[PDB]
UniProtKB/Swiss-Prot annotation, chain A:
One of its GO terms (molecular function) is nuclease activity. It is found in: Cytoplasm. This is Putative pre-16S rRNA nuclease. The keyword Ribonucleoprotein does not apply. Belongs to the YqgF nuclease family. GO terms for biological process: rRNA 5'-end processing.
Length: 149, 151
């Protein structure tokens, strides 16, 4: 189940958010401004079997003083499973900072990723993963402010 | 009519693109990396009757060495096409020879997203920077479409 943006039971209030798109080999990362309005692309983290990506993702949360971390949740058919496993591993690592699952279905991110795949050079493939992170994070921020109003 | 991303007849090859979302009071600005892959927010420019905003947009195009400037084109009914067209034409005279192109907003959900943000704005802090989100979305659409057209 995706989490609900701006849920009062979970919302930590104002501050920078981190947003994460979990790819097969690379993880796109975005962050918000301190007032949690606007997503900006940050970096593409290399996914490695030994989990060094979890160390970098937790370092980024610390570096940006993130109050909330958002991970894209793809639809179960399609994997959700990989996103959930990263979200859970990261949640343990960055506690007490909360990690929330953003429903990808509220965006066109899955279509967009599929368009870039067919269009996208290796360096470019890397950096373009941040565009998904921005889109998922922006959705969360937009939905959150809407829910709060 | 919107321009066609990656049109081999007009494409200038490699370089940073500036992206622009034309609001009634505020203009959001975004820009790409030099390889025209990824849109990042730049700033919000206050619109004003005296045309100062046109000067600031040209300033950004020069500073970021834009090889192309992309303006969001909304539908003719509705933000209105005519507003965006007018700004695009005025901007084109100032950034020449840099070409100014019109990106079809209908290939994105930018119109819905802006409505949602407007509805949710309850603070000046939000209203400042929020227009950059539409600029990023429209510009990223241009970049995605361009890459796919060229592939």
């Amino acid at each position: 189940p995706p989490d609900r943006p701006g849920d009062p039971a979970h919302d930590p209030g104002r501050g920078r958010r981190l947003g994460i798109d979990v790819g097969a080999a690379r993880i796109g990362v975005a962050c918000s401004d301190p007032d949690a309005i606007l997503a900006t692309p940050v970096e593409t983290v290399r996914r490695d079997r030994s989990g060094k990506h979890l160390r970098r993702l937790a370092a980024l949360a610390a570096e940006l003083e993130a109050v909330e971390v958002i991970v894209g949740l793809p639809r179960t058919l399609a994997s959700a499973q990989d996103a959930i496993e990263l979200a859970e591993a990261l949640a343990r690592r960055v506690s007490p900072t909360p990690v929330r699952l953003a429903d990808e279905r509220l965006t066109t991110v899955s279509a967009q990723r599929s368009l870039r795949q067919a269009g996208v050079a290796s360096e470019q493939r890397a950096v373009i993963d941040q565009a998904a992170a921005v889109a998922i994070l922006q959705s969360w921020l937009d939905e959150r402010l809407a829910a709060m109003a």
